[PDB]
Design a protein around this ligand. Structure first.
Ligand SMILES: CC(=O)SCCNC(=O)CCNC(=O)[C@H](O)C(C)(C)COP(=O)(O)OP(=O)(O)OC[C@H]1O[C@@H](n2cnc3c(N)ncnc32)[C@H](O)[C@@H]1OP(=O)(O)O
Ligand SMILES: CC(=O)SCCNC(=O)CCNC(=O)[C@H](O)C(C)(C)COP(=O)(O)OP(=O)(O)OC[C@H]1O[C@@H](n2cnc3c(N)ncnc32)[C@H](O)[C@@H]1OP(=O)(O)O
Lengths: 222, 222
């Protein structure tokens, strides 16, 4: 296996770690134990179909962290769910929800500090509200005015949008409708969303809403 | 961590190995390096969501071999693809096809001998041909009489049937039609099918056919 090793600059500043990511290409230097050695953490993402790469990376000391499924949904005029655009005043509530809901990502212990995953996704949802990572966060409210669901969205290109984060017990159908309507309004044909392999509730909901699988992957760390 | 460790009786005789399967549970002896010692190969299948078990096993030196997705679809509106029940005379051709099609299985080298996977899948399809009404291999024919595709099927219980192997380039739709019809003929309401996480062509076909995800798992070996 040949691959470049490059620092994950953003994550390093955010987590306070010395981490890099492997990028497998024909032209890169040989991937060797010596090259990998000084890094506190190294990450690799590979297609789940590529058993050659899996074996090669396991023979360089990498372990499975999690599998990922990336799905796509056709976008049509589904009509709105009554969702509203999150405002700056919703940030504390959303950060709290997200930190609780996304504690078990690929930034989980023992790979990262116990609080790292919650911090990462609290920041993600805040950035969505502010429009600096995702473009918007959309919210559903209960009768009491409390948030019962949210979904963050961004435009990817001329044809595609992507769900960043999505959460809300019993609100899955409505949140998918919300995300598809947002994409439709922006002239997209395709709405993309990825989830962990283990997240059967999410997979089921995406498929119920019209998704099909586009790619599958493993994240492996050293 | 506690787990039972049991010999894989059939595989041991078939492959000529001394292997066992580990299943993590509270009412079992501690899972230790010593308990794992007297085996040539140990397997574990875990829910993809169970990262606690993943890391327990990785601490004991288990490695990912592959991920699986199990899906189900309702048996509703069925029809006749023109498929036929495989006969003894079809066995040599089917063994040849299945050995080739399912090469990159969880019995691939380096985990097993180079010929192991081919032997296993040829035996699988042969067993299906030599089955009764409860376990069959069905063949789709080209106009030449050649095998265009095949699917193995088993009755599970009062409500369910399961697809074992399914293969035929350009024949996915017709093979799913065949399977649904077979299940219907036995008054089954639910059809189940598992595939490897990396098999996006199979995943897409199953979802196109109305399947949704039921469970996801990793196979790890030591
Ligand atoms: C882009 C991304 O963020 S991907 C990750 C998606 N987000 C999450 O995982 C956040 C937590 N999950 C959720 O908010 C919701 O489960 C959703 C949005 C994924 C799905 O919502 P819905 O389709 O309405 O499903 P709902 O929440 O009603 O769940 C139904 C059942 O799934 C189960 N379930 C739901 N989430 C989980 C979970 N994280 N772990 C285990 N079981 C779960 C529940 O037990 C529930 O009850 P039942 O099994 O007794 O029927
Ligand atoms: C229960 C089980 O056995 S699950 C495993 C299913 N069986 C297999 O994987 C055997 C090989 N594959 C096949 O027989 C079939 O392609 C099926 C049944 C999976 C799907 O059939 P269809 O839905 O008709 O898809 P089709 O055969 O048209 O394939 C579509 C594309 O996927 C690709 N593809 C199919 N199987 C595979 C595979 N195992 N690995 C990589 N790519 C594949 C094809 O090359 C084709 O590419 P193209 O569109 O660029 O020509």
């Amino acid at each position: 296996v040949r691959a470049s090793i490059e620092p994950l600059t953003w994550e390093n500043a955010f987590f306070g770690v010395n981490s890099a990511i492997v990028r497998i290409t024909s032209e890169a230097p040989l991937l060797t134990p010596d090259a990998l050695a000084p890094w506190s953490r190294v990450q690799a993402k590979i297609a789940a179909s590529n058993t050659g790469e899996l074996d090669a990376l396991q023979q360089l000391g990498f372990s499975l962290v999690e599998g990922e499924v990336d799905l796509a949904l056709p976008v049509n005029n589904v009509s709105d769910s009554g969702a509203v655009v999150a405002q700056e005043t919703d940030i504390p509530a959303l950060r709290q929800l997200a930190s609780a809901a996304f504690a078990q990502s690929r930034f989980r212990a023992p790979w990262y500090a116990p609080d790292a995953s919650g911090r990462f996704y609290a920041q993600w949802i805040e950035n969505a509200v502010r429009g600096t990572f995702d473009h918007q966060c959309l919210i559903l409210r209960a009768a009491s005015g409390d948030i019962r669901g949210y979904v963050s969205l961004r435009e990817l290109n001329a044809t595609d949008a992507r769900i960043g984060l999505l959460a809300g017990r019993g609100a899955g159908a409505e949140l998918m409708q919300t995300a598809l309507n947002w994409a439709y309004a922006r002239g997209k044909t395709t709405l993309r969303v990825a989830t962990q392999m283990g997240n059967t509730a999410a997979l089921k909901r995406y498929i119920q809403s019209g998704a099909n699988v586009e790619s599958t992957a493993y994240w492996l760390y050293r």
